[PDB]
Design a protein around this ligand. Structure first.
Ligand SMILES: CC(C)n1nc(C(F)F)cc1C(=O)Nc1ccc([C@H]2[C@@H](O)CCCc3cncn32)c(-c2ccccc2)c1
Ligand SMILES: [Zn+2]
Lengths: 55, 277, 275, 76, 134
């Protein structure tokens, strides 16, 4: 936290990250599924069920 | 006894070559009669390269408005090898001379490319009787029917659709080089006698015929045919307010193919499914 | 396989075209000599595309013009990387002493030569049987080698199959009849096979042939397999296909009716209302 | 002396030369006969392509040798 | 499908570093054998439930689905997973294409049986078909 999230040039863009990686995990996870559970996705993405729907 | 396609008459060929009747009218040649051996060897060479491209020469003669092809020999390939192999045409004992060249389009439809049309222009300019065959190996393998590509071109500085399946890539090349060549109606001739007798080896298969799996083998072919028929009919309507006859003929052939497939399926169902019920 | 000979249908068409061209050129039928090439895998023949090898047929004797074949060797090697000389073909009936002499000449080039004798004047149903090749019989004194016929197979690739199907009757005699004759022939030969199997079963039942416990078991399995795909999903798919073809026929009967109506109105506009 | 060149289709042209004439002279003669540029044209004798620098010393025929003309694209 | 009754011997000749655990209680040996069992079971099954997939491959439900989805998205295994009903669909036949291949197998049985008849009784077979057509 004191080596990455310190300067404003990286703290501001930390929001763009932790979302692209979550998108790539989500895309690969739903690849072999025809019907998947949203709460199941939340436990894999480590985010809330409401946030899964927004993503 | 019909036949009469063989027995190369030298005097008539020299007379028709010296007369040069195709110089006056540009649309002289309209019918291309490929032989059984020509097709067999052409398709075998086309499939003997897989996705790679093959090319060779095809020998034959000219009679009136028809161009008859009797034989075809492959080529090793642009280097000296092809030119050295070209001497085969005059080295063997055969009176058919050379009439054109065939080359394969593995998965790129049947049209003529820009370099292809330029080579055909040159060949027609300095070798008057010449035709280009653009058969497709992948399509005949997948659909089970041979698609022909007799595509004689127009002369330079002169001004006067069927296999439109190229999805994205080469369709641009199709559009620019489209009015530079005109297709030839391909009408196959069987020598009868010996070959008609020996065609019983087809009957020896008897299993691919009894289980043909039609109507799904060439489903994309029929969808493309209907797609072409749609704007053929739209052009017929625009002219009307005879292209309508051509559109009707195309619809009749497509429908006949579909009903033939259905008849085969019904025959198979009666033969196999309706037994021991 | 017991003798591992596999002929390709392209060779037969090659020989037929050669014979027909020579017959037309010289007026009368004439004996021809060729050269079968192919791939050898120890015990495999696998004949493929053949070339002319005209040689000579002078009077009653065949001269050794095989230098032309030697020149053709490097020529055909340029387009056929994995193909080598295997034998030669001819047109005629039973083997002749001239065939023996030509075979002796050919054995100079290759150690294991074949001898195809495609007969074009045959008038009997089954195809002329290709090659009568031999292992060469040796006896004390003169060799006096003969030919010991061994069986052949008609293995073919997919491109050859499609080409042969296209040359065969497929789409004055109407397209319906041409399409139906192929099915008639296929069903006829299948019916002949099934009828002969039934005849064997009846013969075993009566007692003409010895009871083979395995042939009748295979026949029982074949009978049990006879109702092919009788599922409810197969019926649904078949009815879907039939309905699709019916709609495709309706669209096109409509087109033909429109064309005929257009012709009728064209003829009607120049007969009654002259404007 | 007076040789004949045939194309693949079989068209024959009769061109007259001298023993010391070059192959470029052959190509120019064919140009004056039909109009084929020399760089878009290849000459074959006895199944071997002629080199573009040898003055027909081994091609001595004295009786009108038959030459083979093959059209080819510029530079392959 | 390789069971656990034929794998104890193979672990004997394995090198010691090849017996390492993958932080899940499963050795390397019994991780490529459950993937192999899953791929092999795709050929004997049209669709299998999660519970029965774990009753055949051990590892009942926690990682049976995870391995199944891991083999897919990599091209190693063809199929799709319906998590609501807990069924893994492997590969299905479209009825009509199956009809053609079943017909071909039926015709091949006729040809194979034809050879057997001729082999056993060449004399009886020969005279049979000639008079049959006439
Ligand atoms: C008849 C032969 C000897 N020939 N004569 C003359 C003429 F100049 F005399 C000219 C020629 C001659 O080889 N042309 C030619 C041109 C282009 C291609 C390739 C080229 O574009 C590359 C992309 C693929 C392609 C799709 N369609 C044509 N091609 C080929 C060719 C086709 C198949 C295999 C090998 C070569 C031959
Ligand atoms: Zn091309």
């Amino acid at each position: 936290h004191s080596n990455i999230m310190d300067d404003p040039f990286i703290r501001e863009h930390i929001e763009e990250l932790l979302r692209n990686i979550r998108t790539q995990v989500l895309i690969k996870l739903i690849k072999p599924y025809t019907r998947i559970h949203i709460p199941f996705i939340s436990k894999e993405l480590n985010i809330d069920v409401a946030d899964v729907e927004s993503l | 006894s019909i036949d009469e396609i063989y027995k190369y008459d030298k005097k008539q060929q020299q007379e028709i070559l010296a007369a040069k009747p195709w110089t006056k009218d540009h649309h002289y040649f309209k019918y291309c009669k490929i032989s059984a051996l020509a097709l067999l060897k052409m398709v075998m060479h086309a499939r003997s390269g897989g996705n790679l491209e093959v090319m060779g020469l095809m020998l034959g003669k000219v009679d009136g408005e028809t161009m008859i092809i009797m034989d075809s020999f492959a080529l090793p390939v642009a280097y000296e090898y092809m030119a050295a192999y070209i001497e085969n045409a005059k080295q063997v004992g055969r009176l058919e001379n050379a009439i054109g060249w065939y080359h394969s389009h593995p998965g790129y439809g049947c049209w003529l490319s820009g370099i292809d049309v330029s080579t055909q222009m040159l060949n027609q300019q300095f070798q008057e009787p010449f035709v280009a065959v653009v058969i497709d190996p992948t399509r005949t393998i997948s659909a089970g029917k041979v698609n022909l590509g007799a595509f004689r071109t127009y002369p330079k500085g002169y001004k006067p659709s069927e296999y439109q399946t190229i999805p994205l890539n080469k369709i641009e090349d199709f559009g620019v080089h489209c009015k530079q060549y005109y297709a030839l109606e391909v009408s196959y001739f069987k020598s009868s006698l010996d070959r008609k007798l020996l065609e019983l080896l087809w009957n020896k298969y008897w299993v691919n015929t009894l289980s043909s799996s039609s109507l799904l083998t060439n489903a994309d072919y029929t969808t493309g045919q209907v797609f072409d028929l749609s704007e053929k009919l739209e052009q017929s309507e625009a002219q009307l307010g005879d292209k309508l006859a051509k559109a009707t003929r195309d619809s009749c052939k497509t429908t006949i193919e579909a009903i033939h497939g259905l008849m085969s399926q019904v025959i198979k169902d009666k033969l196999f499914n309706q037994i021991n019920i | 396989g017991s003798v591992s000979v596999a002929l390709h249908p392209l060779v037969i068409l090659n020989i037929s075209d050669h014979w027909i061209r020579m017959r037309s050129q010289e007026g009368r039928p004439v004996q021809v000599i060729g050269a079968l090439i192919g791939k050898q895998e120890g015990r495999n023949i696998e004949v493929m595309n053949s070339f002319e090898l005209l040689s000579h047929t002078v009077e009653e004797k065949i001269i050794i013009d095989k230098e032309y074949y030697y020149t053709k060797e490097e020529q055909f090697k340029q387009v056929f990387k994995e193909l080598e000389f295997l034998g030669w073909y001819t047109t005629g009936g039973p083997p002749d002493p001239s065939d023996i002499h030509v075979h002796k000449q050919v054995c100079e080039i290759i150690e294991s030569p074949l001898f195809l004798k495609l007969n074009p004047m045959t008038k009997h149903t089954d195809l002329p049987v290709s090659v009568f090749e031999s292992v060469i019989d040796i006896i004390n004194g003169e060799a006096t080698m003969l030919f010991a016929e061994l069986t052949y197979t008609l293995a073919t690739e997919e491109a050859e199959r499609i080409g042969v199907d296209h040359v065969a009757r497929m789409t004055e005699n109407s397209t319906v009849a041409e399409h139906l004759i192929a099915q008639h022939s296929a069903i006829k030969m299948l019916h002949s096979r099934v009828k002969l199997i039934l005849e064997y079963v009846k013969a075993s039942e009566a007692g003409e042939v010895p009871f083979n416990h395995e042939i009748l078991r295979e026949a029982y399995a074949l009978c049990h397999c006879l109702p092919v795909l009788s599922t409810d999903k197969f019926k649904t798919d078949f009815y879907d296909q039939c309905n699709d073809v019916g709609l495709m026929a309706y669209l096109g009967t409509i087109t033909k009716t429109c064309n005929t109506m257009n012709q009728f109105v064209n003829k009607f506009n120049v007969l009654y209302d002259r404007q | 002396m007076l040789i004949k060149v045939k194309t693949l289709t079989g068209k024959e042209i009769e061109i007259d030369i001298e023993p010391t004439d070059k192959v470029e002279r052959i190509k120019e003669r064919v140009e004056e006969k039909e109009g084929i540029p020399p760089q878009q044209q290849r000459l074959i004798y006895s199944g071997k392509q002629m080199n573009d620098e040898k003055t027909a010393a081994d091609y001595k025929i004295l009786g009108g040798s038959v030459l083979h003309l093959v059209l080819a694209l510029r530079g392959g | 499908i390789i069971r656990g009754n034929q794998l104890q011997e193979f672990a004997a000749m394995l090198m010691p570093h090849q017996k390492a655990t993958t932080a899940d209680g499963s050795s390397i040996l019994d991780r490529a054998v459950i993937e192999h069992n899953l791929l092999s079971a795709s050929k004997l099954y049209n669709n299998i439930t999660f519970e029965e997939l774990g009753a055949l491959l051990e590892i009942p439900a926690a990682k049976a689905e995870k391995i199944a989805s891991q083999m897919i998205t990599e091209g190693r295994m063809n199929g799709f997973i319906d998590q609501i009903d807990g069924i893994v669909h492997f590969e299905t036949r479209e009825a009509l294409p199956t009809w053609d291949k079943q017909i071909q197998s039926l015709c091949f049985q006729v040809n194979n049986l034809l050879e057997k008849i001729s082999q056993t009784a060449p004399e009886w077979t020969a005279q049979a078909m000639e008079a049959q057509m006439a």
